[PDB]
């Protein structure tokens, strides 16, 4: 069931992949200074990577499957225990280094190249 | 297909009433427009009704209190003026002037600390008889409120003129205004419209009359709350203005003495010229014409056959008993007698009105703060545009016994309620959904 | 013609459905405190429901019609007088209660399910 | 190569059209008052015309070409020297006094008419 | 019990009860006040 | 750091008409007399 905010955080990825709006809806939901300080950081801490999400080619949705392959030297793990045994709290660790080259070749090889295939096919 | 499907819409024009703050916008230094935003696009609305309700409006409150906070924001960084309370050796000034000007203008004398701390200094001035009270030869005196408050002076270079001001709402909110000619407090207005920011208001402090104010349309009206209840007050508004002139007839120099470290004082100097008093002329016939008009109006609210009488002020303190208002950096208090002198039944010259002036005021009805006001060198003229007044009634008896009216007032909040009745600000809501014939699409 | 801001609010729904950008464009268009107080107020009072229309699968447009049926128990009114006699000021009232079950059932039944079918079918 | 922020600003338009995310990523990247003043300033100056191109029918992408022709009375210049000799700093000048009719007939003529054809054709 | 460092004897000790015990006290005297003005517009109270 | 060099571009400067000269010139005023305020009021040094 919908447990709550950060609800299924200890469970496996496949059950965590089932329900995800519960993280979305809670994400925006003399001493005046720090209420006004809290609110501006809250809204722009949100939409800094909302616009970085927008440049990732699927600004609307929450999951999009785009045109980019995978350097197998990042990890060579068979598909089962990727989705059956390891959970998300473990998963971020071993790609904590490639995260920049992840973000590097993310859309600067896609929303640069699907850019270009728009530019010279779909714009053509 | 015959099963329908819901779709979204965005920007459906509906509103609900709420309340947030607003902000001021306008276009040497005065209290108001030191730093605000400079500035039409009125949009007419139609085919829609709305029920107004003034006296439950909220914007009266926050504007009423931020002009409190503006006023005592302004005076603060000028000089803390404490040691002005030692005894006063004092007498009436200039006897054998047997005119109406006799009790006026006592001259007084005292001690004052010098620039450097230990020495003493003696300096001499004039004051008005309402300024300073004796405690039980000369007598010993202290001015009227050295106790229960402090005193400080307005630093002389800033001005007291009222700039017009616009009020304006932030985005996501809407200004709606009734465009009816005749309007009586509440009602369904069949012709309303929207604006972004309100029109101009000059917020001048006034008691018992409204001054350089906004006019009305061709028929004079009344506004109240309780109309047969008699507790609260009564506002009226005229259609055509009449005018007013008054002045102070003296040339009256000033002098400057330092008090302590790096401070300056001004006192009222001495009188060149003769001695007269402040008086204020009005046109007699136009005044009778307009008041006969307003009583001929208000006979609708008390029966066509009854007798009505105008009487003077009741009493109390000076702050309620007379019409009082500044002009150019001073304060007025006239007698206000010869314009509530008439009675009324079914079937080139002018009018003088005496007027005294005070030097320090304690307005706002908030005991604890008191300003000193520097006297002004030179002669003063003061003209105005006369509009509306306020009124109250007494108790009485059964409803034939010649009802009587008196100019009352006192409270500051109603002084604005006369000129933002036509406003209501509201929150829009742009989201709605509806079923329709969208064959549901992947 | 383009009358103005909240212009056709008294008219019927069909005429109101014709022109809608005049509401969109004017939605964003010691005494500094309430200036800075008003502005943060207005900006996130805008995009709180900008993001919660973004979760509704049509973040771009202003009218989308998705894959969700209609329950007749909400109202049994035929299509004609829905779009011909009642205006929008009346319309919100009779669904002033069911508004939560609208917002409830709306995309928890859709924006997973359609993209559950995307993730399992057209990326298969 | 990727020069930097405002990098190819002096060069021609075609080379400037090659790389554009370097402008995108830097666009959001007693004395507290002007800090809090500046941050709200920057975020509203961003997403004022972020929503004003979000209304322009291609809120997600960076380049879209929609269903609207061109008035040759604006300029009669052939395609070559548009993209080969004139750079961007010149280009805004000759459509300075006109930009309003661009933004005018751009939006009110397109995202309605195509969505009228949605609501009436594809949803018939 | 709660400490940070218990073998370290420098700092303090916290404990927490499981049931409350109660406490009464009071001041047994009837007292008066008087008001004297200081200077401009101020008010003082002393023990009478 | 992250200084970025530019190329194929001209610009005409205008010193003596800059605005930031003023901005920092007045907030250094306000900083200076912000700093001294909450320490000692020193009046009676004039006998
Ligand atoms: C009600 O309506 C009246 C309409 O008259 C309105 O305005 C007043 O207008 C007159 C006309 O300008 C102002 O009177 C003077 O104008 C002359 C121009 O020569 C000046 O000399 C006067 O002051 C100057 O001199 C001072 C001496 O150094 C300077 O310190 C000062 O800064 C000026 O430079 C003066 O301006 C008059 O000021 C106004 N206001 C009043 C209250 O008379 C009036 O404001 C309206 N409201 C009220 C509440 O009366
Ligand atoms: C302001 O303060 C000054 C400084 O003290 C006053 O000067 C001195 O004031 C005192 C009392 O006010 C005077 O004393 C009296 O003089 C008569 C003269 O015979 C004597 O009979 C009294 O018993 C008493 O001494 C004094 O003369 C006077 N001057 C000097 C040089 O001491 C001044 O009077 C004060 N001003 C006021 C109160 O208005
Ligand atoms: C501070 O001092 C002032 C002035 O000395 C006081 O104001 C006055 O207070 C007295 C109190 O006895 C009042 O006097 C009354 O006057 C009326 C006049 O109608 C008279 O009928 C009474 O018999 C009485 O004498 C008076 O209202 C008031 N004002 C004046 C001009 O005298 C004030 O009370 C003192 N205290 C505080 C806390 O402010
Ligand atoms: C308690 O607080 C302090 C630091 O927050 C630590 O206390 C004492 O630390 C000294 C200094 O290291 C220890 O004494 C001697 O240390 C030397 C280091 O060369 C070692 O060679 C000796 O054998 C001896 O241990 C001492 O052990 C230690 N504890 C005491 C006096 O009770 C200590 O780290 C803190 N306790 C914790 C974190 O449990
Ligand atoms: C304010 O003036 C309006 C003018 O239309 C009055 O409205 C109607 O007045 C008639 C007079 O006989 C009443 O019978 C109606 O009931 C009023 N209309 C409605 C909708 O009630 C209104 O009475 C006046 N109100 C006041 C307080 O003076
Ligand atoms: C206005 O005055 C009336 C005058 O009495 C107030 O009181 C009620 O008045 C009515 C007359 O309709 C009597 O019949 C009632 O009996 C009175 N009260 C009771 C307990 O029965 C009324 O309260 C006043 N206030 C306002 C603003 O209307
Ligand atoms: C107000 O009325 C008085 C009284 O009539 C006017 O005072 C006259 O002023 C002139 C000009 O100096 C003198 O010559 C007259 O002697 C004054 N008295 C009379 C009885 O005429 C005054 O001018 C009027 N206006 C103002 C603004 O005070
Ligand atoms: C009011 O008093 C002032 C102060 O004396 C008068 O101004 C003087 O006028 C004479 C006449 O020309 C000049 O010679 C002096 O230089 C003036 N003095 C100053 C300080 O300017 C003034 O005339 C008097 N009357 C009026 C109506 O202002
Ligand atoms: C304002 O003028 C009126 C009219 O003179 C004054 O009222 C008079 O006051 C005296 C003293 O109480 C009474 O004897 C008179 O009967 C009152 N009327 C008359 C005809 O004089 C009033 O006192 C003056 N001051 C104010 C503003 O009240
Ligand atoms: C205000 O209301 C009137 C009547 O409801 C509107 O009248 C229009 O009348 C013509 C006549 O055939 C019809 O074709 C229109 O469809 C009516 N419009 C509507 C909205 O009902 C009048 O147009 C309304 N005002 C506005 C600005 O819509
Ligand atoms: C449309 O209307 C109501 C709204 O939920 C549904 O009726 C419910 O049906 C269940 C099934 O027995 C009852 O237990 C509930 O008491 C009913 N009412 C409510 C308010 O829930 C109806 O099933 C809905 N239809 C569909 C297809 O969802
Ligand atoms: C404390 O002392 C006060 C002051 O006398 C007592 O209050 C008085 O009690 C008598 C008894 O009825 C009354 O008649 C007086 O009016 C009271 N005076 C005041 C100022 O209230 C009080 O009873 C004493 N005891 C307490 C507070 O326990
Ligand atoms: C917690 O772990 C147990 C172990 O099998 C599992 O059965 C259960 O489903 C887990 N909880 C959740 C919420 O996944
Ligand atoms: C994967 O990344 C590493 C990073 O050093 C690189 O050496 C390797 O060549 C990459 N593999 C492929 C196939 O690109
Ligand atoms: C899949 O991973 C597990 C993890 O140890 C391993 O035991 C298994 O042999 C792997 N399967 C293949 C085909 O390599
Ligand atoms: C990975 O990230 C960590 C973060 O500290 C960094 O220290 C490390 O050098 C990076 N690469 C390696 C070898 O872990
Ligand atoms: C009032 O004073 C002005 C000053 O210019 C004068 O013109 C006018 O005649 C006076 N009287 C009236 C009744 O306005
Ligand atoms: C009142 O005005 C009328 C003019 O309509 C006039 O007959 C009468 O004398 C006036 N009375 C006074 C006191 O002005
Ligand atoms: C009262 O007098 C007014 C004055 O014109 C008149 O119009 C109205 O008809 C009268 N009403 C009654 C009830 O006498
Ligand atoms: C009304 O005017 C007359 C005419 O001067 C005067 O006798 C009477 O005292 C006035 N009434 C008042 C209250 O001043
Ligand atoms: C006063 O009334 C007159 C009538 O023309 C009007 O023109 C003026 O604007 C009003 N205000 C002033 C200050 O005269
Ligand atoms: C549509 O609703 C109206 C409302 O009274 C009704 O008269 C009409 O018969 C309805 N049409 C159908 C087909 O039910
Ligand atoms: C609809 O909303 C109102 C708001 O008070 C609520 O009180 C009411 O219960 C809800 N109406 C019903 C009865 O569903
Ligand atoms: C700068 O202009 C020269 C002139 O032809 C050109 O050769 C060069 O490629 C230009 N550089 C850039 C970065 O555009
Ligand atoms: C281009 O704009 C002008 C401006 O008035 C207009 O007259 C002309 O018809 C437009 N061109 C076309 C093809 O519509
Ligand atoms: C393109 O523009 C150039 C600019 O002078 C011109 O010489 C050339 O003829 C134009 N080409 C065509 C096809 O008109
Ligand atoms: C173009 O814009 C400028 C800015 O000053 C304006 O003054 C000018 O009128 C507009 N020029 C034309 C001729 O449209
Ligand atoms: C404290 O005094 C109260 C008086 O009401 C008494 O009832 C109680 O037993 C006392 N002791 C406590 C609370 O331990």
Short mmCIF file of C-alpha atoms in Angstrom, two decimals, chain A residues 33 36-37 40 43-44 47-48 51-52 54-55 59 107-108 111-112 115-116 118-119 122-123, chain D residues 17-21 24-25 28-29 33 36 39-40 43 46-47 50 59-63 65:
data_model
loop_
_atom_site.label_atom_id
_atom_site.label_comp_id
_atom_site.label_asym_id
_atom_site.label_seq_id
_atom_site.Cartn_x
_atom_site.Cartn_y
_atom_site.Cartn_z
CA UNK A 33 13.63 36.16 8.16
CA UNK A 36 11.29 33.74 4.03
CA UNK A 37 14.73 32.14 3.91
CA UNK A 40 13.11 30.48 -1.36
CA UNK A 43 11.45 26.28 -4.21
CA UNK A 44 14.72 26.70 -6.03
CA UNK A 47 13.58 23.44 -9.55
CA UNK A 48 17.35 23.59 -10.07
CA UNK A 51 15.25 22.46 -15.12
CA UNK A 52 18.16 20.04 -15.28
CA UNK A 54 13.86 19.54 -18.39
CA UNK A 55 17.04 19.54 -20.42
CA UNK A 59 10.58 17.22 -18.89
CA UNK A 107 22.32 14.37 -22.85
CA UNK A 108 25.50 15.99 -24.12
CA UNK A 111 20.15 16.12 -26.29
CA UNK A 112 23.22 16.99 -28.32
CA UNK A 115 19.30 17.38 -30.91
CA UNK A 116 21.31 16.86 -34.08
CA UNK A 118 16.12 16.58 -34.88
CA UNK A 119 18.26 19.35 -36.42
CA UNK A 122 13.20 16.05 -37.97
CA UNK A 123 14.05 19.69 -38.60
CA UNK D 17 23.67 26.89 -33.43
CA UNK D 18 25.89 23.88 -32.78
CA UNK D 19 26.27 24.09 -28.98
CA UNK D 20 23.76 25.78 -26.70
CA UNK D 21 23.51 24.05 -23.31
CA UNK D 24 21.38 26.75 -20.23
CA UNK D 25 23.37 25.29 -17.36
CA UNK D 28 20.44 29.10 -12.76
CA UNK D 29 23.89 28.45 -11.26
CA UNK D 33 18.98 41.71 2.27
CA UNK D 36 17.67 37.34 -0.60
CA UNK D 39 17.90 35.17 -5.53
CA UNK D 40 14.17 35.85 -5.92
CA UNK D 43 14.45 32.95 -10.29
CA UNK D 46 14.20 32.97 -15.34
CA UNK D 47 10.81 31.46 -15.25
CA UNK D 50 10.18 30.04 -19.12
CA UNK D 59 7.95 23.83 -23.45
CA UNK D 60 10.22 20.81 -23.30
CA UNK D 61 12.67 21.24 -26.13
CA UNK D 62 15.07 24.02 -27.06
CA UNK D 63 14.29 24.25 -30.79
CA UNK D 65 9.37 24.83 -35.58
#
